[PDB]
Structure 1
Amino acid sequence: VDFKLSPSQLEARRHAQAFANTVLTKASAEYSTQKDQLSRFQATRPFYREAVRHGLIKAQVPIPLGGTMESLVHESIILEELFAVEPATSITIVATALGLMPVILCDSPSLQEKFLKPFISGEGEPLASLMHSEPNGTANWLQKGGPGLQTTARKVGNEWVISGEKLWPSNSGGWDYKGADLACVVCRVSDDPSKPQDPNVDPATQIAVLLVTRETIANNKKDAYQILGEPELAGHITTSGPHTRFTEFHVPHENLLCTPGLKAQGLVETAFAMSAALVGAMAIGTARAAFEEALVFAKSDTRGGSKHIIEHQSVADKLIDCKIRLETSRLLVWKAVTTLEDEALEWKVKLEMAMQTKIYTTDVAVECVIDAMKAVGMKSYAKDMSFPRLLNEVMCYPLFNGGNIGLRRRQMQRVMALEDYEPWAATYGSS
């Protein structure tokens, strides 16, 4: 067992830090003057253009598929550096990565070649989005006997027709509400959308993923695809994740990701399990920013006392708990991503590890930011420090990419409940 970083892992960090410091620090001056979510998002376009130019979008795609991703650990390192400085743009990169993943994970080389092309070219500002979440919620999308996804699709001739609404998926409307360059739309197959999901059929068998592009949207009537709204968010105020309605929206059969059913569900689950693990690096980044700002402050400020405040046990106890939370978090993220990369391991073992990671890292980052604020004191409450921004941004993490209470805990629970569950298979191997 080994924790040493390769020169390429160290270079990835250096590269990521430099990008964050020289480019991402300039974003605030641009987006701060904009007075709604979309305007703020549009104001980050030149930074994502720079991200593309720096090869960061290409680094979201595995090398066998023509990308530049060296490993998930490299990716983890990069995301922590980006998020420790500025989630603006950084969030758009990971959202794109997630949007690309169903394609990256499917086993069709020609679909891959076709749809990944703009993302590996190193040019423009191509956006991807995994359009799963809905206005009515999704924690119970797989519940047998429940309503299921409210976005449904039916086959009509050589075409699929999408009806319903998505809400939350980052990048989904593109820069201009004419659509992301690639959206993966998750639907429940239904021949009559006005009829409830058949309670005698397993919801996972009815799942389909349809690839929707700018061209797809252009080939539809204008009111077949509409942005109804854009949520004003507590934090991550420069991201876009609109309320989209599909009305009789036509998609060619060649844009179906795979045969509807368990294989389509498996592509979604795999992608959200990859993300579950990697989201820990975003949480670490945000919390580390908090911990470091508090650490620096505590080692150079006496707060009208005679000694630096890090010398008070109560202040140091906070910084200690923060440090422990960040250290355990990163270890768990690195464990999770290498587990996911281990071909000798069963899915359920990878999934369990990925759920734990999401749950821990995201809950604990919140505590870390709040403890840092408490240690710094009143000064952390004003926007000449970064804590107000960090507080709002860190609270996204336990809620997003499938919230801990409704989704991640439940997925983990289902695995632990399995008769052949091996708690330590990822550590000591399978018996």
Structure 2
Amino acid sequence: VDFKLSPSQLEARRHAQAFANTVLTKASAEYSTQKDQLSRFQATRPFYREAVRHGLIKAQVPIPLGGTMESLVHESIILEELFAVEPATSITIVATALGLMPVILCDSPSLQEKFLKPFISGEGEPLASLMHSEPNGTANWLQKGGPGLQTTARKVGNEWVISGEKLWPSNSGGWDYKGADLACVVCRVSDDPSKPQDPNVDPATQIAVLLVTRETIANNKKDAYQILGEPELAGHITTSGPHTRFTEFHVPHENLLCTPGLKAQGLVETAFAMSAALVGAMAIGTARAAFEEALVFAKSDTRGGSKHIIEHQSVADKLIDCKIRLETSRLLVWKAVTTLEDEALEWKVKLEMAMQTKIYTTDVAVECVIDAMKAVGMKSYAKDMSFPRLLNEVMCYPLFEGGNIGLRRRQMQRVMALEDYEPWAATYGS
């Protein structure tokens, strides 16, 4: 046990720091004049282009597979620094890394080689998307007896036909609504999309993931793929996770990521449990910019009295608590990622640790922005301070990458319920 950072870990951080200040700081002058969600997301392209030009997309892909990813701790340190300054574009890198996951994670070197190609290249503006989420929601997608997913696939010849709607998956229609360079569309296999799911089949056995690229979309009727809309979001106002209708959408059997069933759900599960751990780095960075603006203010403004605000017990108390949450949070994300990475542990041990991390860090970052604001007082509520932005931004986190109430709390409840559950396995082994 050791918490020291190697020189490569410190360079990643200097690097992510330098990119956030020199490039990210300028994003806002471009997007803030834009009209609606997409205009703002599009005003973001030059900065994501830089992100690739700085090698940050290549760093989403492990070295065995062509990329420059050194570890998940490196990745945790980079996201925290990025989010600490500007979640525009930074959010696009992460959506893209999530998009690449189920490939990154498969049995097929040829799929890996085929699909990872534009991201590991160092040029353009390539975008991935794990399209799981729907208009009718997903907390119960694996429930025996229930509607299951409403994006369905049937096999017609040597292709697959997709029928169904998706909502929220970031990046999913690219910069232009012609689609994203790669997108892993998660489906339920239904021969007849007019049939309810069979209440007697395990929903997990019917999962299929089907890659879909700008090519697939194009080799298809102009209306087999339409963008019905784009949510106007409370914060993260430069992201795109549109409403997408699939109508008789043809995709080649070669684009099938793995056997449908338990193996396809495994990859979606594993992808999502990784992003669950990494997302705490996003919360950390946001709440960290809250606390740091609050700290600098409290150490330099006396608010009409004789001493700096930090000298009031109640002010220091709010700051102490933010600090505590940030520190315990970080420790937990690093603990989580390192546990994911450890080949000796069973999956369910790694999954329990990831759910904890997602739940704790996202919940606690909310508390941390709000205490920061409360300590600054009325000033924190005017837009010449970061706080109105941070507050909207920070509320995404318990909600997204699978909300705490619906998904992550249940996934951890299921694991704890198991006969052979070991609460301390990630620490004390066995």
TM surpasses 0.5: yes
CA distance in 1, matches of 2:196, 2:340: 36
SS of 2:11's partner is helix
CA positional deviation for 1:206: 0.1
**CA deviation string 1:178-207 (max 9, x = no partner):** 000000000000000001000000000000
CA distance in 1, matches of 2:108, 2:150: 28
CA distance in 2, matches of 1:240, 1:278: 20
**CA deviation string 1:138-195 (max 9, x = no partner):** 0000000000000000000000000000000000000000000000000000000001
CA distance in 2, matches of 1:167, 1:330: 30
CA distance in 2, matches of 1:114, 1:223: 27
CA distance in 1, matches of 2:4, 2:44: 35
CA distance in 1, matches of 2:305, 2:226: 59
SS of 1:182's partner is coil
Counterpart of 1:25 in structure 2 is 25
CA positional deviation for 1:345: 0.1
Counterpart of 1:196 in structure 2 is 196
**CA deviation string 1:27-83 (max 9, x = no partner):** 000000001000000000000000000000000000000000000000000000000
Counterpart of 1:125 in structure 2 is 125
CA distance in 2, matches of 1:124, 1:162: 29
SS of 1:192's partner is coil
CA distance in 2, matches of 1:185, 1:162: 9
CA positional deviation for 1:120: 0.2
The percent identity for this pair of structures is: 100
Residue 142 of structure 2 contacts residue 148 of structure 2 at CA under 8 Å; is this kept in 1? yes
User: TM (normalized to structure 1)?
Assistant: 1.00
Counterpart of 1:106 in structure 2 is 106
CA distance in 1, matches of 2:312, 2:107: 58
Counterpart of 2:301 in structure 1 is 301
> Aligned ranges for residues 23-422 of structure 1 at < 5 Å?
23-422=23-422
CA distance in 1, matches of 2:152, 2:421: 34
CA positional deviation for 1:107: 1.4
**CA deviation string 1:305-331 (max 9, x = no partner):** 100000000000000000000000000
| Alignment: residue pair count | 430
SS of 2:237's partner is coil
CA distance in 2, matches of 1:134, 1:25: 33
Unaligned ranges ≥5, structure 2: none
CA distance in 1, matches of 2:29, 2:17: 19
CA positional deviation for 1:351: 0.1
Residue 107 of structure 2 contacts residue 258 of structure 2 at CA under 8 Å; is this kept in 1? no
CA distance in 2, matches of 1:384, 1:219: 48
CA distance in 2, matches of 1:379, 1:7: 40
CA distance in 2, matches of 1:108, 1:281: 30
CA distance in 2, matches of 1:35, 1:175: 16
CA distance in 2, matches of 1:234, 1:200: 40
Cα RMSD, aligned residues only: 0.3
**CA deviation string 1:122-148 (max 9, x = no partner):** 000000000000000000000000000
Moved over 2 A (4+): none
CA distance in 1, matches of 2:53, 2:115: 19
CA positional deviation for 1:26: 0.2
SS of 1:250's partner is strand
CA distance in 1, matches of 2:361, 2:179: 32
CA distance in 2, matches of 1:164, 1:141: 14
CA distance in 2, matches of 1:222, 1:146: 33
**CA deviation string 1:73-97 (max 9, x = no partner):** 0000000000000000000000000
CA distance in 2, matches of 1:364, 1:224: 42
**CA deviation string 1:244-287 (max 9, x = no partner):** 00000000000000010000000000000000000000000000
Unaligned ranges ≥5, structure 1: none
User: TM (normalized to structure 2)?
Assistant: 1.00
